[model samples]
Every structure is written in structure tokens, then in C-alpha cells.
Target: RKFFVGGNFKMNGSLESMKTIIEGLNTTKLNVGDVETVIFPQNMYLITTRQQVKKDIGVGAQNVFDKKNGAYTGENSAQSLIDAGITYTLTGHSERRTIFKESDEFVADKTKFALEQGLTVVACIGETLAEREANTINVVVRQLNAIADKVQNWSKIVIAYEPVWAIGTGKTATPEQAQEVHAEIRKWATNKLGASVAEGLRVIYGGSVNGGNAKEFLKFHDIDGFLVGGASLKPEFHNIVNVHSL
Candidate 1:
């Protein structure tokens, strides 16, 4: 699997601002490594934003409902995103889990639905600051296990371990700590699925990441890439995509 860098635009951005970002990406020659780039814009801009970017880059959605179609108002389905040229979607994002009250089981169901319908996912798993302070690393393991039980195929999924504490707090897990979690996740995959599948799984980090610190995370072999949040909206995102060269 290639190193992957994903931009989570979240609920921010105007159509005009998005246009400028896409235009910059469309025109710049990025000094990228063996990397797969996926960016999630707000759902409303899915089609238009995707159309504006080049083929090498992918447009994704910030969320999805597990159902294919229904009377579920305000719920966006994986099918709808797929139809709109949104190739990727997020499940179990910290905000959705914390703010909107999505459960691990719900996230797992959403992830399965996305995969079954042919959309890729960056499924999130993490421990809250309190949970971490509680010395409960198993919180992440439990979250990971929940998704594994709900979905059989993980080929199209990227595991994003974004510590709830680190997100938007400007505090990142030390490389050693990040690798510790990733190593454990890899071990779990090897035991449950097999070495072949585990080896290919792209375990990425998220939270408070920017060009200045992206290179620091790269030193850990288990940390494949990042799921960028705040910095993705800026021209600095260009620096992030080209971190190695910059």
C-alpha cells in the first residue's frame, strides 16, 4: 500500500474557496512519494469539487448513512456519494462520535455499507484524553474490533488512529506512542486476518498535523501517512503534499 495523505475539509469552506484550493492543486506539480491522496469536501460540493480536481487526486465525503436509500431525511447514503464521484467517505470520525453520538457499531455498519457499495473509507478509531489518562489503550482496540466484526473486507479501508485528545488541540502523540498503537493494530490484523492482509493495511495518523510535523510522523514505519484537518484548507496544504521536497 502507498503512503496515504487525506484532507478532511469537514464543515468548512465556501464554494469559491474550494475552487481556489482545487485550482492550486490542479496546477501545481507536487513532489509526492509513493502516496495516495484523498480529500473530503463537504457533501454539497462532492460532485463539483471532484470534477474540478485531476484524476490523480480523489474527492471524498465527510460522512455517510448506512442505508442505501430511505425516508431518512438529512441522512446521506454511500450510494449517493458514489454516484456523485465521491470515491471515499469517513466513518467513526471523532466529531461524529463525540458530538453527534455515533457508536462504534454504527460506524462499523456505515463502513461496511460504504465498502459493499464500492466506496473507500477512512475509518477512525481513537481514545479520548480521559480514556488515555485512564491508561485504557484498549479503547482503540475495542473500536478496531467492532469494525472488524461488522466488515469482512478491509482492502478499501484505511485505519485512521486519531487520538481524540490530539485533534485540534495541537498535541500529537510522540512517534513512539503512535507506533506502539499501530504495531498492536498490525499484530491484531495478522492474527485475525493474516500477515498478507495486515502488511498491506495503511494505518494513518490524524489530528493537528501540518507540514512542520508531518515529517516527524514519517519516521515511524507503522505510521503510513496522515488524515489532515485544519491545514487542508490552506495553501499550506500544498506544502503538506510536498513535505519531502519542502
Candidate 2:
């Protein structure tokens, strides 16, 4: 399988800056050799980003609403994103769960909705520091289960394991720690879904992944790629993109 990397711009960037970013990508010789790349700009810039970027790259929305159309003030609908030419979205992110108080069921609903709308989803699932210290890693699996229970298909989904304790804190999971959880998730998929699906699943890491550490994590067996954060906004991201080119 080709490596996958996604840049999560979060609640950042102006249209001009985004144009500059996409312009940079357009001029640079990216190593597309067996790699799948996507950039998630804020919903306000989704259409513009999609239109401006080269076709080999994909543009995604930072969030999506489950309902097709509604008076759900200040929400982006799944259909709307699809119509705008967005092919991907995120759900169950730590920010939504922590800052916005989105529940597991809510995330799952949005994920299922996005899939139904024919959009790919990078489903976020991971444990908090307290949960990890308490050895309750099942909490992560539980988050995954919410989506599994609601959605019948898992083909268009990528699993992003972003440890909340490490996000923006400069701390990151060691390759060993990340692999252990990844292997666990793979086993869970093997049992819940099937061997073929599990084998082909892209279980990527997130939370402080940067050019410095990306290469190290890339060597792991189950750590497929990354859902990059801060580093994605910088030029060194080029190194991370060519991470395994050689």
C-alpha cells in the first residue's frame, strides 16, 4: 500500500496564505511515488483550496455535520462538502471531544454521514494521559467501536491515533508505544472486521509528528503514515512528505 499523510490545518490560515501554501506545493517536486496526500483546510477555505491545488493532491474539510441540510447554525453538512469537491473529512478529533464536548455517538454519526456522502474520513481515536496511565487503552477502542457499530463499511476510513497528552505539547509517543497501540488496533480490526480488511487498513499516527520524528516512526510495522499537525504548516514538511521516498 502507498504511504498516506494528511495535514490538518485546524482553525488556521487566510485565503491568501492558503494560496501561497498551495502555490508552494505546486512548484515543489513532491515525491508522489506510492504516497497519498491530503490537506484539510478550514471549511471556509475548502472550495478555494480544492480548486487551487493540483489534482494529485486532495482537499478536505476540518469538520462535517451529519445532517444533509438543516438550520444547524454554523455547521458544514456532509453533502455540502461533497458538493464543494471535498473528498475527505475528520471525526472524533480530540478538539471536538475536549473543547466542544462532542460525544462518541456524535462523532460516529458524523463519520457515518460523511461515508454515506461518499467522502473519505480520517477517524481520530486515542487515549488521554489519565486513561493511558490507568491502562484503560480500551477507551480508544471504545471510540473506534462507536463508529464501527454505526457504520457497516470501513473502506474509506483511515484511523488516526492522536494521543491527546502529546498534541501540541511537544511530547510524542515513542515508536514502540505507538506500535503497541497500532498492533492492538489492528488485532481489534482483524477480529471485528476481517483479516483482509485489517491487513489493508491504514493505521496512521498523529500528535506532534514532524520531520524530525517522522522517519523514526515510519520504520514501524503498523504505523502506516501520519496525520500531521504543526509541522504541516512549515517547509520542513517537505522532508516528512519524502519520508520514505528512497
Candidate 3:
């Protein structure tokens, strides 16, 4: 697979503002031949953003419910995203897990549902500072395993490791620390799911990723891509997309 970069807009834009950003991106000299890009906008903007973006730039839903159809009020089903032409969905994001109180099981169910609907899954898992300080990297592994137990395969899954403490805090994980967690997750996948599946899985890094630090994290063998935050809202996102540019 080509290098992948995703923008998680995360309830951060108005229609007019989003249009300006999208218009800029559409005109920018994006290195589409070198990198595969996807933008995850808020659910309300998915359809409109899809129509507004360039053909090469894909759009994703930031969240989706596991059920196909139900009395579950204020929830969007996987089928709804699919019907709306969304190609990807982010599950278990730190914001969702922390603020919304989404459990590992709920994330796994959402992953399963997205896969069933033929949508790619960016299954996010990470640790907070307390968990990391307490040597709970295994806790992160277990969270991933919880999803693995349900999904049965990683074919359509892209694992995003977004350390909760670092997200939107301007405090970034040093390359060593980020690689340590990424390598551990890759090892866990290799051991539990076999080498082939592990090799094919894309383990991406999130949490305050910006143009300055993007290439640093991208150097690790296990770190396949990025799930970008704040910087993604700017034209600087093009700099991140071309991180290795000369």
C-alpha cells in the first residue's frame, strides 16, 4: 500500500470554513501519486464534503454506530455511512473513548459493523500518560486484542495509536516513545494474528502530529501512516502530505 495520511476534522469546521479549506486543498499541488489521503469530517459534512473534494481526495465519517437499523436515537449506522459513500470510519478515537465513554467492546462492534458494510476501519487504540507511566502498554495491547477477537481479520483495518495525553495538548511523543508503542502493537499483531496479517496491517500514529514532527514518526518501520489533528485544518496539511519532499 502507498503511504496513507488522514485528517480527523473532529467537530471542528463550519460549512463555509470547510469549503474554503477544501477549495485550497483542491488547488494545492498535493502529492497524490506518492501518498494516499483521506479526510474524516464530522458526520453532518460527509456527503457535502464528498461532493466538494477532488476525486483523488477521499472522505470518511468520524464516527458511526454498529447497528444497521434500530431505535437508537441520535446514532448513525454503518450502512448509513456506506450509503452516503463514505469509504472509512474512525473507531475508538481517544476523544470518543475519553469524552463519550466508549468502551473497547463498543469500538470493536463499530469496527465489525464498518467492515461488514465494506468500509475501511481506522481502529484507534492508545494509552494515557498515567497508563504509560504505570507500564500499561499491555493495556493498549489488550484493547487492540479486544478488537481483534471480534474482527477475525485485519484486512480492512488500519490501527491508529493515539496517546491520549499527547492529543491536542501540544506535547508530542518523542520519536523513540512513539516507536516503542508502535513496535509493541506490531509485535502483538504478529504473535496473535500471524505474520502475514501483521505485515499487511497499517499501524498509524496520532496525537499532535504536525508537519514538523510527521517525518520523525514516519521513519519507524511499523509506523505506516498518520491520523492528523489541528494542522490538518490548515494549508500546512500539504506540507505534512509531502513530508519527505526535497
Candidate 4:
């Protein structure tokens, strides 16, 4: 599997800041190895970011409504994102699940809809502090299972495991801690979706990743790449992007 890096810019960035970040990325000497890099900017900047960003890098939406169009009012749909030149999207992020109270089935439905619209999905799955304390595998399994039930094709889906407690808190899971769960995700996929699909799945890590420690997770077998948060906005993001070189 190719290494994948997804920079989720989240609800941050204005026109000036987005330009600065994209300019930095376009000018940087990124490792042109077997890697796929994509960035998720807020809905407002999707077209502009896509227009300015280097063609090799992908632009995506942070979230999208399941339907193509209708009276959803404020929600952006998969068809609209695709029309805007968006090639990827994130569903089931910890923030969406907790903040917006998006249920697993809701996330799954969006995952299915996005895939049908030809958008590669970084479908996130992980546990909160309480859920992890009780049972980590169960939470992730349940989350992944929901998507599996709704979507048949796994080729365009990349699973991101972002522990809620660690996000924006600077508390990262040790490589061992993260790998233990990554392995379980692989195992669950093998059993649920078969070995070939499991082998090709790019299960990535997220939550509080920075230039300093991003390389540590790459040493593990199951960690294909990352779904970076805040650090993705800085010049230091180049380091995480080039982690494969070292």
C-alpha cells in the first residue's frame, strides 16, 4: 500500500492563511516516493485551494451531506464537492461524532454516498478516553462495521484512527499503543471484508501529530500514513510529508 498523508485543516484558515499554507506545500521538496498526499480545507476555500494547490496533491472537503441536492439548506453534498474539483472527503471524524452528535450509521451513510460520488474517503474511527478505558477494540470495530455494512467497495476508503482524548491535547498514543489498535483494525477487516481488501486498505493514524513524532508511527507495519491535524497548517508539515525518506 502507498503511504498516505491527509491534512485536515478543519474549521481553520482564511484566504490569506490558506494561500500561505498551500504556497509552502507547493514550494517544498516533498519526498516523491510511493505516497499519496491530500488536504482538506473548509468548504468555503475548496475551489480556491484546489485551483492554487499543485496538481499532484489532492483537495478534499471536511464533511459533506449524503444527498446530491435538495433542501438540505446549509449542507454541502457530494455532487457539489465533486463539481468544485474536490476529490476526497472525511467522514466520522471525532469532532463530527462528538460535537455534532453524528451517529455511526449517519457517518456510514455519508461514506457510502461520497464513494458513489467518486470521492476517496478518509473514514475515521476511534474511541474517546472513556471508551478506550473500557474497551478500545470494541469502539473501533463498531465504527468500522457500520461503514462496512453500508459500503461494498473498499478501494477508495482510508481509515483514520484518531483518539478523541489525544486530539488537540498534545497527548499522542505511543507507537505500540497505536499499532495495537491498527493491527486490530486490520484483523477485523480481514475477517469482515476478506484478506485482499484488508491488505490494500490504508489504515492511518491521527490526533496530535507533529513533525517531531510523526516518523515514529511509520516504523510500525500497519500504519500506512497519517491524518494530521493542527501541525498540517505549519511549515513543519513538510517534515511529516517527508517522513518516508528517513
Q: In order, what lDDT does every prediction score? A: 0.87, 0.87, 0.85, 0.92
Which digits, one per residue and each the tens of the lDDT, describe model 4 over residues 192-229?
99999999999999989999998778779999999999
Model 1 per-residue lDDT at 92 = 92
Overlapping backbone residue pairs in candidate 1 total 0
Measured against the true structure, the TM-scores of the candidates, in listed sequence, are: 0.95, 0.96, 0.95, 0.98
User: Poorest 10 consecutive residues of model 1 by lDDT?
Assistant: 237-246
Per-residue lDDT of candidate 2, residues 1-246 (tens digit): 468899998888976788888887777566777678899988788888899989888888888888889899999888888887899998888999999999999999999999999999999998888988866468888998898899888989999999999899989999999999999999999998999988888999999998888888877899889999888888767777767775
Candidate 3 per-residue lDDT over residues 44-122, each given as its tens digit: 8889999999988888888889987889898877887778778888999988998999999999999998899888999
Query: On a 0 to 100 scale, what is the lDDT of residue 123 in model 3?
Result: 91
Inter-residue clash pairs, candidate 3: none
The TM-score between candidate 2 and the true structure equals: 0.96
Candidate 4 achieves a global lDDT of 0.92
Question: Residue 28 of candidate 2: its Cα lDDT?
Answer: 58
For model 4, the stretches where C-alpha displacement exceeds 4 angstroms are none
Model 1, span 14-74: residue lDDT tens: 9789899899888867644556888998878888888899888988889999987888998
TM-score of 3: 0.95
